[PDB]
Design a binder for these strands. Structure first.
Lengths: 54, 55, 56, 54, 54, 54, 57, 55, 54, 55, 54
DNA sequence: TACCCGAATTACCCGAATTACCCGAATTACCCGAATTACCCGAATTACCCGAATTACCCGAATTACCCGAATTACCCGAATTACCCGAATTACCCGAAT
DNA sequence: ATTCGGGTAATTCGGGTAATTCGGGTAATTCGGGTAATTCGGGTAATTCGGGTAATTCGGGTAATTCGGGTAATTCGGGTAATTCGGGTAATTCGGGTA
C-alpha cells in the first residue's frame, strides 16, 4: 500500500495536520500506525475523498 | 493542486466569504469540501478569474 | 502576490463623489476595474491613491 | 524465512530507512545482520505490524 | 559436510550472490571448490552466521 | 581400491551426477567403469580435491 | 599349483562398488565366468576380475 | 587313486572345509575315510564338479 | 604275501608315512618288520580298508 | 638238501632291494651259502621264519 | 666214490645245471663223465663245498 | 455630477459545527564521511528435460561361514635303515643233437 | 624227459651317497553338531549414461544503499478562539435617463 504522511494529507485538503488527526480518530479516515505511533493514511482513499467519491 | 480557503478567496475580491459560498453554491466557482463540510477553492481557478477569464 | 482592492462606495467616498460616478470613470477607463463573479466592480487601491496625489 | 531490506521496510510504513534502523536498535523489530553490517528484517513480522498485530 | 550454492546463501541473507562471493574472497566465510571453480559454502557456518555467531 | 558412485561423489561437491561425469570425461577425475558402464571414482581422489590438493 | 584362485560374489562386488545381485547378473550375462559350488553359489576367477578393473576385455 | 584332503577341496571351491564335509555328508561327494575317520576325496571327482559335470 | 612300504600305504590314503606307523602301533594294521626295523604292510589288508571292510 | 632262496627271492618277500638283503647277511642277520661263483643263497626255513618275527 | 647228477648238484646250490657244467668246465668241481658224456660230480666234494671248505 | 427607478448582487445577525493555533514531550527527517551491497558485462561451469539401460533393492528359501573341545593328523629332528648309483664278473635262459 | 654244447640279458657281486624310516613331541587340521550372514530364484523403483539449452557463477567496476551519530521539523496529546457552515432581511450595486 502507498501511504501519505499527515503533512501531505493536510496539504491536499488545505487543512492542518491536527485536523487530519481529529479527522482520523473520528473514524472518517482509515489510518495505519508507525512503530513510533505516528499515523499514515491510504493514498487511494485520500484521493477518492478529494475527488468526492463516497 | 493548491487550494484557497474561502477566507482567502474572499479577501481577493473584497467580498464577504458568505458570498464566496453563494458563488460555489450556484456553480460559478468549483468547490472542494474537507471531510467536515468546509469548502476550499482552487487557487488556479481564482487567479484566472481575477484576470477575467470565464470558467 | 495579492492586489488590494477597493469597493466602489469605498472609492467614491474617497473623492466625495457618488458610486454611480465611479462606474462612469470605469466605463470610460480612467480607472482600472476588476469584476466580482456577480458583476460588481472593485478597484486597485494602489491606483486610486495614486490619482489622489495626482499622478497619471 | 523471507527477508526485507531496510529500504523496503521503510517504504511500507512511509518512513526513512535511517528510522527503521532506530526501530531495531530500540528492539521494536527483529534484525538480521549481513556479514557486512547491514540489517535485514523478517517479512512476516513486519507485515504483522502494519495491520497492527503486536 | 553439507553445502550450499552461492545462490542459496544469497537467498538466505537476502543479499546478492555476487556479495556472498565478495565475503568469500575476504575470508568472512569458508569457501570450497568444485573442479570447475564454483564455490560451495558449509551449511553449518552460514546457518550460524544468520543466528549471529562468528 | 575403495570407490564412490557418482551419486555420492556429487553429494560431496553440491553438484549433479552429470557434472561429475563431465569432470571424468574431461580428465580431472580417475574413473573406473563397471561391466554395465556406470563410472565409479577413486575414494581418496575426491577428498583430496576437497582441500585443494590435485 | 593347478588351481584357479576364486572370489565370492560379495568380494567381487566390493571391488566394483556394486551389489552382489548385480555381479550375480553379470554372470548370467556372460560378462564373467561362474563357478558353481556343489550347493549353488557362484565363485569367480580372481584373474578375470582384476583384469576388467583396468579396462581389458 | 590320487586323493585330496578336505582342506584341498575347500581351497579349490573357495569354501570352508566344514562345508566340503557337510557335502560328503549330504552325499554330494564320494568320501574315503582314513583309519582315524578323516575324510579324503578323489581328485578326478572334484575336478569334474569344478568344470560343471554332475556324477 | 604282496607287501607295501609305509610310503606306499601313505600315498594311498593321502597321509603321512608317520601316520601309517601310528596306525600300525594302534593295531589297525598288520605290520611286518624287516630285519632292520622298517615295517611293511599287507596289501590285501590295505586295499581292503580303502574300500570299507574291516 | 636245504631249500634255498636267491637274494632276489628273499628281497621280494620283504619288499626290499636285494642289495640290502646282502647287507643283512654281511651284517649277520642271515645265513649265507656262497655259490662257487660268489653269489649268496639263503635258507628258506630261516627266511620263512623271520617273516613271522622269529629271532 | 658216491656221485650226484648235475641237477642234484644244481638243486642243492640253488642254481641252473649249466652253471654246474660251467663250474666243472672251469676247474672248481671234479667231474667224471659217464660213457655217453654226461658228467657226474663227487657227492663228498660237493657237500664239503656247501659248507665251504676249499 | 448628482439623484431618479427595477433588478440584482452583496453585507450583516445567529446557533451549531468545524477547523486553527497554543503549551511540551516525543518521534521523525535529512545532515556527513566511510563502508557495504546492487547491478552491468562475456567465457565458462552447472542444472535439469529425454529414453534406453544399468544398478539397487524387497522377498522366503537354502547354502555357506564360523562358534567349541576332543581326536587325529602334519611337520621339526637326529640316527639308523634302506634305495639306487658305478663297472666287472656270475648266473639264467633262448635255438639243435645226444644221452 | 634230462645234458652237451654255446651266446645273450638279467642278476649279483664289490663299495658310496641321497632318500626313507624309525622314535618321540607340538601346532595345524578334521572331527562330532548349532546360529547368523550370504546367495539363491524374479521383479519394480531409483540411479546413470548418452547428448542439448538455459540459468548460474567465475573473472572486475561505478553508482546506490546503509552505517554510525546528531540537531531541526514534525507529530504525537488537549483546549480555547476564530471560520465556516446553513438560513434570513436589509444595503449596495448593476443596467440606463434628466435635470
Amino acid at each position: 500500500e502507498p501511504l501519505l504522511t499527515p503533512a501531505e494529507v493536510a496539504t491536499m485538503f488545505r487543512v492542518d495536520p491536527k485536523t487530519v488527526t481529529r479527522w482520523a480518530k473520528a473514524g472518517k479516515l482509515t489510518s495505519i500506525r508507525t512503530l513510533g505511533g505516528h499515523r499514515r493514511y491510504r493514498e487511494a482513499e485520500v484521493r477518492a475523498l478529494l475527488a468526492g467519491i463516497p
